[PDB]
Design a protein around this ligand. Structure first.
Ligand SMILES: [Cl-]
Lengths: 259, 259
């Protein structure tokens, strides 16, 4: 399916690692869809070159450039830089439908059945569950929607200073409309919810299709012991999946660029 | 509307205070429905007498008694005592439809529009938002459903040792079925979500219809300064509403029993 893609975003090298693990995880679970990554010029050439191998398409977005449609909004709302860059996922009109996934998510199972969903489908955010979590969503590229989102970003900004606020504001019927636009939580399982509601994780977590690494420490911020195959200093299994992919597939990939 | 009620539960004197504040809060916001409270014999006579004034119906449930239908299940699963007592809300067949509200909830606005909903309607639980939070739900009394719930309690218990696990297990299509059975989060606003996702609270919290006091410290565990009209040692406004009702309406009510 060439006109459908998973789309992610990396604005730096640290998140490129996440994006590389994510992309690898999607390939590992045999997606039949394209993989696209939005990148900024702040992503270094070696990460970019690795991204070009993992992803079918690497799209460079430079909202710091005057030529960018989001640039004026950036000047108005400089804290929305990441948001405005992410919003360019809607510019990818070479695709009819996409699943956006933040670079700090990890695919545990094939999730191509997401492409049955309509814009805007997303899992509930823990914390304020009448908002959707913007880490994973099904959307449809459209210059119009992009422009409309830009306009809301310009006019109202984001109630949380992030892309999630903006997206919830724009796609505001999510909470009260169409249960099919509630992605099951297992398609965007907040790593924090392992703690916040442990019995529920015990009951339903084995079904996790996507893990979303939230909180202060991102997976790449951990130390991974390659001998014991575990991160150190915590329910580590998801981190360990992330690190195994990173160790097995991503590092060896980045290593071949030194030659 | 005589065949519809808000129903709560108190198993002790501390929660009776909550139940009294809840009942008062419902009267304050002019419910046209009946108010029913399930009570246990562990609730003292003075609390019971106060409950008889606030609530239209005080129902005594004694699952420790052999004569109780839930009693055998209690012996099997003694940790489910509170759950099994709460499940008796389904025994209240004098009502055609009820909103169950835990005694640690607080009504901030008329919520009689809940009676438009069907069993089982409930707000998402923060933490694991594909579970509903069992603090507030619309249900329909039925001996059959009661029996079915008892049976699931007996057979499977609760994945979280509480009523929420059991109810989610029984009413398991909630996450994926019928958006109208997702009560808006503002009908069961987790006091913890004030912290967990503060920008969202800032954005949507002013619309709170029901506050659900979760976490270690219940409202009655705080110290309330009646002069400054605030609790001490925190976004205190909801606690302060709880305490104002408690101070204005509940304490004076309990005071008239000493004569
Ligand atoms: Cl629906």
């Amino acid at each position: 399916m060439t006109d459908q893609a998973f789309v992610t975003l990396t604005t730096n090298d640290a998140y490129a690692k996440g994006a590389l693990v994510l992309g690898s995880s999607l390939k590992q679970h045999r997606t039949s869809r394209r993989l696209a990554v939005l990148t900024t010029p702040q992503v270094s050439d070696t990460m970019r070159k690795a991204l070009e191998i993992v992803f079918d398409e690497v799209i460079t977005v430079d909202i710091l450039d005057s030529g960018d449609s989001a640039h004026l909004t950036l000047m108005k709302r400089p804290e929305l830089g990441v948001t405005l860059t992410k919003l360019h996922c809607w510019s990818l009109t070479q695709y009819s439908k996409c699943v956006f996934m933040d670079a700090d998510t990890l695919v545990l199972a094939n999730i191509d059945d997401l492409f049955e969903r309509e814009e805007l489908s997303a899992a509930p955010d823990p914390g304020w569950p009448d908002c959707f979590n913007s880490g994973v969503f099904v959307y449809q590229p459209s210059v119009e929607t992009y422009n409309q989102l830009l306009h809301v970003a310009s006019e109202q900004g984001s109630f949380d200073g992030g892309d999630q606020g903006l997206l919830n504001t724009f796609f505001n019927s999510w909470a009260t409309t169409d249960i099919r636009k509630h992605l099951p939580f297992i398609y965007n399982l907040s790593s924090i919810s392992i703690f916040s509601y442990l019995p529920a994780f015990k009951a339903f977590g084995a079904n996790a299709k996507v893990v979303h690494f939230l909180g202060q420490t991102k997976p790449w911020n951990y130390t991974y012991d390659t001998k014991t195959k575990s991160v150190r200093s915590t329910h580590p299994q998801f981190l360990n999946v992330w690190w195994d992919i990173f160790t097995t597939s991503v590092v060896p990939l980045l290593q071949q660029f030194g030659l």
